[PDB]
């Protein structure tokens, strides 16, 4: 419940 | 829920040791499993994270403990595992299992590094 | 590398009455979903942390009603209603948003006033 989804900029 | 940690004690600097980690009451290989270690100097940072099967296993490390440790999962032993070489004197202290950032947490094992 | 810090060190509550607890970050953790990763914990004396609150406001399994978390932004607090004397430890806050690294407040110790 605690993660964050990642982000990736290319 | 409960995760019981393995492994540590004294080492002497350079030396090497490894960090297991045993868990249950959660669908462990669906979580994230880090190790996050607890000192007076530098209180609690997180130290490592394996990912899922579906990730490919990922992995993070932090700063202080790239190219020196692997963290590893087997999905068949509910387990996670920390391999550590080159200890230094800053990587003494409590060293916690945990599922999530940070669902679940280990009663925590010691590590202390010293000549 | 976000920073967490936690005030006050030590705060005294007298049972029953309600205690807050401070965090604040070095950056703005509103995700790009629009959640903010912003936990709580909760380490008794000799045990391990234990998670109490995630995502601000919401209290996680076996968790007290008495126990709640507010804010945004940068600027977060715990409250703790109804004081217990089983609430004692220290509280630590820990961000999930800005990542990796995984980081972690200082931690303040709840005491009770008795």
């Known amino acids: 419940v605690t993660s964050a989804p990642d982000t990736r900029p290319a | 829920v409960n995760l019981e940690e393995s492994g540590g004690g004294l080492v002497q600097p350079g030396g090497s040791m490894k960090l297991s980690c045993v868990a249950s009451g959660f669908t462990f290989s669906n979580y994230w499993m880090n190790w996050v270690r607890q000192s007076p100097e530098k209180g609690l940072e997180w130290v490592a994270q394996?990912?899922?099967?579906?990730?490919?296993?990922?992995?993070h490390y932090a700063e202080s403990v790239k190219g020196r440790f692997t963290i590893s999962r087997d999905d068949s032993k509910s387990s996670v595992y920390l391999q550590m070489n080159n200890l230094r004197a800053e990587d003494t202290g409590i060293y916690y299992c945990?599922?999530?950032?940070?669902?679940?947490w280990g009663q925590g094992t010691t590590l202390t590094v010293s000549s | 590398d976000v920073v967490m810090t936690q005030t006050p060190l030590s705060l005294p509550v007298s049972l029953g009455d309600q205690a807050s607890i401070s965090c604040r970050s070095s950056?703005?953790?509103?995700?790009?979903?629009?959640?903010?990763?912003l936990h709580w914990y909760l380490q008794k004396p000799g045990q391990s942390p234990k998670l109490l609150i995630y995502k601000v406001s919401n209290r996680f399994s076996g968790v007290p009603d008495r126990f709640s978390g507010s804010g945004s932004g940068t600027d977060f607090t715990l409250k703790i209603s109804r004081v217990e004397a089983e609430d004692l430890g220290v509280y630590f806050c820990?961000?999930?948003?800005?990542?990796?690294?995984?980081?972690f407040g200082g931690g303040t110790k709840l005491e009770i006033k008795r």
């Open positions: 945990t599922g999530g950032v940070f669902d679940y």
């Open positions: 950056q703005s953790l509103v995700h790009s979903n629009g959640n903010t990763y």
């Open positions: 820990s961000q999930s948003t800005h990542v990796p690294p995984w980081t």
């Open positions: 394996i990912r899922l099967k579906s990730d490919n296993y990922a992995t």
